[PDB]
Design a binder for this molecule. Sequence first.
Ligand code: 5RH
Length: 447
Amino acid sequence: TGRLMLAVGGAVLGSLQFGYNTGVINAPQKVIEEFYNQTWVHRYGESILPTTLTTLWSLSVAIFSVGGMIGSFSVGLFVNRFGRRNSMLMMNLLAFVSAVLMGFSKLGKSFEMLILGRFIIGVYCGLTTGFVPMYVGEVSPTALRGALGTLHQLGIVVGILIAQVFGLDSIMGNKDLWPLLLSIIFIPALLQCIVLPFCPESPRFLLINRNEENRAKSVLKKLRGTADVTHDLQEMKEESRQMMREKKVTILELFRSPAYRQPILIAVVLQLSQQLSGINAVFYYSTSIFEKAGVQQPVYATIGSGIVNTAFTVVSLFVVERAGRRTLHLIGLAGMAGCAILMTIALALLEQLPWMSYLSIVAIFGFVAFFEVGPGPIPWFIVAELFSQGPRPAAIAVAGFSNWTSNFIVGMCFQYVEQLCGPYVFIIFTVLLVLFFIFTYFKVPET
Ligand SMILES: C=C1[C@@H](C)[C@H]2[C@H](Cc3ccccc3)NC(=O)[C@]23OC(=O)/C=C/[C@H](O)CCC[C@@H](C)C/C=C/[C@H]3[C@@H]1O
C-alpha cells in the first residue's frame, strides 16, 4: 500500500498525457489555423481557401483518432511479449517523437509534421489506454483494485482540464507558444521514463507469461508490503483458471456465431451512442462553438466545461455502485438531448436576444455533465457484462474499434456539418440521441 503508490501513480501519467492530448487542440484552434494560412501563403503566394482550412485542421485533430484505433489493437501485442511495465516505458518514444514533431512544426513551416505528430501520439494514446488499466489491475490488491482503477478515468478528465488551462492566451494558447503547448507532453514522458524502471513488473506477467514464479514472489512482498503472500499468489492462479477455463474466441468468430450476433449489436451501438452524441464536438471545438455564440472570454467557458466534466466524473463514481446501468444510460441520452435542444435555442435566439450566449454555456455544461453519468462509463460496463471470459476480450476490440471509428466521424465531419446546418447542428445530435434512447429502452437489458 506504500510502495504501491509509486507504480500506480507512475502509470497514471500516461492517462494524464492521454487526456492532455485530447483537449489541447480546443482553445488554440484559431492561432494554429492562422499558422496554416501563414504557411500556405509562404509556399504558394496565396491565402488558403476557407473550406480547405476546414478539412485540413479537421484532419489535424481527426487523424489522432485513427492512431488510437491502431494503438488499441496493438495493445495485446506488446503486453504479452514485452510485459506491462516495459511496454509503457518503451512507448514513451512515440511521445518524444510526436512532441518534437508537433513542436518544431512551426519552425519547420509544415502542418504535415503537426498532423503526423498528431497521428503518432494517437497511437501512443491508444496503446496507453490499454496499458494503464491493465497494469494497475494486476499490481493492486483485489480490495483496492475496485478503487485504484478509478485513477485512469480521473487522469483523462483532469488531463483535459490542464490542456484547457494552458490553452489560455495568458499561458501557452497563443501565437508564440502554441508549438510548446503541444510539446509540453515531453515532460510527463520524461518523468515516466524515470519513475517506471523503479516500479515492479506485474506479477501476473512473471507468474503466467514467464513462469518465473520465484521472481514474482519478490514483487508482491515489497509491493503488497506484506511479508507473506501465500494467498494473493494462489488467488491469481485461481483467477487464471476462470480466464483459461472456457476457450477465448476471435473477432471474426464473434460475427459468424448467431449466438453472439445480438449482444455485439448492443455493444457497438452503445459505443456509437457515446460518440454520435457529440461530446467530442465540444471537447474539440468548445472554444469554437462558444465564439459563434456571443460568449465573452470563451476559452474560460471551455475550462468551465472541463471542470464540470471533471466534477461529474467523480460524481459518477458514487452512482454506478448505487443504480442500474440501463437507467443511468437512459438519463444521459435524455439530458444530452435536452441540452442539445437547449443549445439550439441559444444559438438561434442570440441574434434576437444578445445574451443567450450565457444559455449556451449552461446547456453545454449540462450536455457534458449528463454525459459523464450515462453514456460515459456505462457503454464499457455493459459490454464486459454481455460476454463471458471467452468472447469478452474480442468484444472489447470491436467496441474499441466502434468507438474510435465513430470518434473519427465526429471530429472530422462536425465542422463540415457546422457550415451547412448553421445553428441547427445539435439537432443531429438530438435526433441521434433519440434513436439511441429508443434503442436502449427496448433492446438493452439491464445488468
Ligand atoms: C471521449 C472519450 C473519453 C472521455 C472516454 C469516455 C468516457 C469514459 C470515462 C471514464 C471511463 C470510461 C469511459 N469513454 C471512453 O471509452 C473514453 O476513454 C476512457 O475514459 C476510457 C477508455 C478505456 O481505456 C476503454 C476504451 C479505450 C478506447 C478504445 C476508446 C476510448 C474512448 C474515450 C472517449 O473517446
